[PDB]
Design a protein around this ligand. Structure first.
Ligand SMILES: Cc1cc(S(=O)(=O)N(Cc2ccc([N+](=O)[O-])cc2)[C@H](C)C(=O)NO)ccc1F
Ligand SMILES: [Zn+2]
Length: 499
């Protein structure tokens, strides 16, 4: 092989292609590798001084609609204004921040592709910028026309280092052994691997020709074999950019040692994306048939959607089975059937996805304003009667995804309770005067996040009331007894409704 010969051999295979790039095609490939960050300068100059002042004083971490990267850029903003315990955010703070959110995003082509799963017409960004992305993406596709071919494809491996958290933030938090960081927690490793059979790249993978030693937080070391018709381009310093929309079969996942630290080897083979989409679609059919039976729904009913497009694809699929099983185990059968039938009556969905929730139609078709769209671990959208669950991310103070689902189902229970109460004036039961008063009293007795408003308080209480941990079910009865009773009352009220 030889690392250096391999490199020169691949470079030569693409030499005509490289020499052919215009300065425009060249600038585009660099824009793809290096996103154009927002200039913190311009940002602050566009604010009024009352907003400069307002921004400085906000508890940024107490936002439920901002990601970590976003929260961090705003603290770096907060401080540069200034160089010249967890109370719920105010109304005028939230409105301000929701709009500021739209002005601090990088122009990041690979990120736009990952967040949308390639559905780049999703109205989750400004239409002018949306077309820019599309122009760049179409141009890059056209550049990437030369396949790796029949000679090189089975004679080379390509490599990618990855952060575990890019696939699953929930497992990533505890994949490195806590008492020794050079070691992989064997139990977590078995779970990460058990349902990792295929993977989709909806963006342009940038891969190394020769394996590169891990940097900070790169415990995943992919080794990838291309197919002869995989299209790619040479990039300087020993790299290849691969075409978007490819499928990978996971051939082997192993713990391995490199320089006295432990790493996860992921061996993968490029296959046609369509082959993997067929597996996904088949599993969607399967899980709907299983759960239409269990719920006494017509067999052709479409209730569960796999909206799946990214690198941990197969786990998002297997995970939905578990999530729904825990849901079934910890919630009364009749409550489940009554509420789910209500959601089916409104064409609702359980959406399990690895794209960001603003790019889910059950959210965006009812939320025209981007400053009102939300990304998070989970969501209930009453206008479309759907529960949305984002696989890859980790919910704030959430053990697992099963608990997150139960919380969202809590929002659905609120919806249906208030509907039954007044079917002509459909409102949320937590908007009722009785519950409002309960909230002003007990509202601070459960989780910190339960303080936000009536709806979340209800959903947290509901979730805690159905925990597998008996201690938690009891802390609600003890610390929030009117809420406890109010909810069990809603539950009886729903279960006793007609057919
Ligand atoms: C605990 C919990 C969280 C979530 S969440 O996805 O993280 N989540 C709430 C949340 C809570 C706390 C923070 N925060 O930045 O502190 C951010 C977001 C969303 C907004 C929600 O309530 N959807 O219904 C979902 C369910 C759930 F049970
Ligand atoms: Zn909620």
């Amino acid at each position: 092989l030889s690392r250096y010969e391999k490199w020169e051999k691949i470079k030569q295979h693409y030499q005509h292609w490289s020499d052919s790039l215009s300065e425009e095609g060249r600038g585009l490939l660099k824009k793809l590798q290096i996103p154009i960050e927002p200039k913190k300068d311009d940002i602050i100059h566009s604010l009024s001084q009352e907003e400069k002042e307002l921004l400085k004083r906000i508890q940024i971490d107490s936002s439920d609609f901002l990601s970590t990267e976003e929260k961090e850029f705003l603290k770096k903003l907060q401080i540069d204004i200034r160089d010249s315990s967890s109370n719920p955010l105010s109304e005028k703070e939230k409105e301000f921040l929701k709009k500021l959110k739209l002005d601090i995003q990088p122009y990041d082509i690979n990120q736009r592709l990952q967040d949308t799963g390639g559905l780049i017409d999703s109205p989750s960004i400004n239409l002018d910028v949306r077309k820019q992305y599309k122009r760049d993406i179409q141009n890059i596709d056209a550049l990437l026309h030369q396949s790796i071919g029949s000679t090189l494809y089975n004679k080379i491996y390509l490599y990618e280092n990855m952060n575990i958290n890019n696939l699953t933030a929930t497992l990533g938090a505890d994949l490195v052994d806590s008492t020794d960081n050079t070691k992989i927690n064997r139990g977590i490793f078995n779970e990460f691997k058990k349902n990792f059979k295929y993977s989709i790249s909806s963006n342009y993978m940038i891969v190394d020709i020769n394996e590169r030693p891990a940097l900070d937080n790169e415990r995943l070391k992919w080794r990838i074999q291309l197919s002869p018709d995989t299209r790619a381009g040479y990039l300087e310093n020993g790299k290849l950019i691969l075409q978007r929309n490819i499928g990978l079969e996971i051939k082997d996942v192993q713990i391995i040692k490199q320089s006295e630290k432990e790493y996860i080897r992921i061996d993968a083979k490029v296959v046609p994306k369509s082959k993997i989409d067929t597996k996904i679609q088949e599993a969607q059919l399967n899980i709907n048939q299983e759960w239409n039976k269990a719920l006494g729904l017509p067999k052709y009913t479409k209730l569960i959607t796999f909206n799946v497009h990214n690198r941990y694809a197969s786990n998002i699929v297997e995970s939905a089975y578990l999530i729904l099983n825990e849901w079934k185990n910890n919630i009364q059968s009749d409550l489940i059937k009554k509420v789910t039938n209500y959601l089916v009556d409104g064409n609702g969905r359980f959406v399990f996805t690895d794209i960001t929730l603003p790019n889910i139609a059950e959210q965006y078709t009812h939320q025209d304003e981007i400053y009102e769209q939300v990304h998070s671990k989970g969501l209930y959208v009453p206008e479309s009667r759907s529960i949305l669950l984002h696989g890859p991310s980790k919910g704030v103070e959430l053990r697992n995804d099963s608990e997150g689902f139960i919380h969202e189902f809590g929002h659905a229970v609120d919806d249906y309770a208030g509907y039954l109460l007044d079917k002509n004036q459909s409102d949320l039961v937590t908007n009722s005067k009785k519950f409002i008063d309960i909230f002003k009293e007990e509202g601070s007795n459960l989780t910190s996040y339960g303080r936000t408003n009536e709806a979340e308080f209800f959903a947290e209480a509901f979730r805690l009331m159905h925990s597998t941990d008996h201690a938690e079910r009891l802390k609600v009865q003890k610390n929030a007894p009117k809420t406890f009773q109010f909810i069990n009352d809603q539950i009886k009220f729903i279960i006793n409704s007609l057919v």
